[PDB]
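Re: export button greyed out
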Amino acid sequence: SGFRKMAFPSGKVEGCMVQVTCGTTTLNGLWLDDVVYCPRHVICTSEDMLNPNYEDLLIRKSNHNFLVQAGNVQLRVIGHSMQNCVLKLKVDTANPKTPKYKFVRIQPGQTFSVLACYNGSPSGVYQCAMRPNFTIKGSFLNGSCGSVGFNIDYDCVSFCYMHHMELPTGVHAGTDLEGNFYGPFVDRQTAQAAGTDTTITVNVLAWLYAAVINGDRWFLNRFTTTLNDFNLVAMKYNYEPLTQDHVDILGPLSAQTGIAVLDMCASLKELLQNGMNGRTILGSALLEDEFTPFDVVRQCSGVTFQ
Amino acid sequence: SGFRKMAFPSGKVEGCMVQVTCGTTTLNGLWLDDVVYCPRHVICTSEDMLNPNYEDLLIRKSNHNFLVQAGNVQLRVIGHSMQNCVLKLKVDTANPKTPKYKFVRIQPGQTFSVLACYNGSPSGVYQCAMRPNFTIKGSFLNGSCGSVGFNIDYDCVSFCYMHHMELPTGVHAGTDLEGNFYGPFVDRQTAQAAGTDTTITVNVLAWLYAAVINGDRWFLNRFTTTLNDFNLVAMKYNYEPLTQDHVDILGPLSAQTGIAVLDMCASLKELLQNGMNGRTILGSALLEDEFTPFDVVRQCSGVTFQ
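Workaround output, generated via the alternate export path:
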């Protein structure tokens, strides 16, 4: 029993983190086989951050303008190319610690682990969700750009996030590992804002199921609701709409607990309309939305990874 | 910016986890140099869990009664001995992935990362505190015994916890790596209870400082309090007493923010007496007590580990 914000074991990713230095800028890169992936703004100077033209900046660079350090070992750059907002540095050594891996672009509402790094050295690991507005509520300081987010599936690391920037509200924006930003953000230091966020309804429901799996039942009721009527109340509380496909995903948790999805929706409805009345669920006084249905099944049943 | 429940990178520990099997019981072990550490109740049978005499059970075992599996490789046991509640299996191969490490017995209020494992395979990583009643609020399922908790300091892994059992309230009890339980608990399946817990006052204060570091100031006030008068209010709310030594530890955070410790105590006092009035601090509607002053400095300033 218990329910924690659980990240994936980070060792397979730790073995891939390196330091990339170009001119006066140092950040993190991801070293897989003989390629180092890092944010393209490594080639930016403090005077070129306002509106850089990266193609023009990069054609002015040579291979030897890029210092890649893996531990206390210098890797030699033998090619470079830009893909969207990431730079790909070909190095002359393949990383012997390369795990089995894929690159995946995730949907908002999905969660992932972040290995926060500075100077190519891992600092900590924590769990994140991609918010509906395509920011993440990370924990990142200067020098963290290039830190990656990932899920692990048996033995395969699916990289889904590379950190690029912090927004004025203190949330974070970045790219998939092919360099495409999540959301409307661009890698220039101009006025940008997150856009209104919403609560991930299907995730809150999964976490209510987690609470029931772990013996919490105080918040249930004898009511039910239609999907339509639930969504009318969700909208009022800034929850995003629950789809039939969300309902289908919650099937396994429904079956394990004996609580119809729409009945758990009626319980959520009541929690939205009445609050929690000084009570807690799984040690939280807020309705938690950063666990997916998969996360709950993984933790309440115990899937490992080799 | 941001503030997350941040665990240490787990890779140095992942490389130490193994599967220990004796008879019908399988659990996790920690493989450092040529010794495998695991809970001594691996030698217990389903009929010997009520009140086992471990010395009598273990003298009946041979080296070959212990199966140690590291990955898809079988390690041969060449000695065994019991130290308190842990068994130490001498194996004929030293773990080539042994990090620099120490064993440390921690004080209640201290935090650590837990690498939850099943069948010697890491499942997830999360951050824990040792509660004042010497339980931890973990997330553990059958088969998790022998999973370890740790801190990392530059390059050195300080193991401080090995998981042994779940209590009826769903919290967890275990030992240091020398096999001494935290708290009054014993490794037998008899009536045991956690004992009344309290909130870790110095940690709540650190987290209030974290909030200020990150730009939250709504909860401050213009009052101050004496240490004596603060402690009179803390007791009423089941907070443990704040000591002058707690005050001293909070010095660096005090100096970084310009807020005297006793002034932050007056802010805490007010939050205890008035509640949070529908407001949140660092994304929590509860006063959070599982970050130490060290944890806050580490995350809000960015210490790495090699």
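The first strand of chain A starts at residue 17 and ends at 22. The button fix ships in the next patch.
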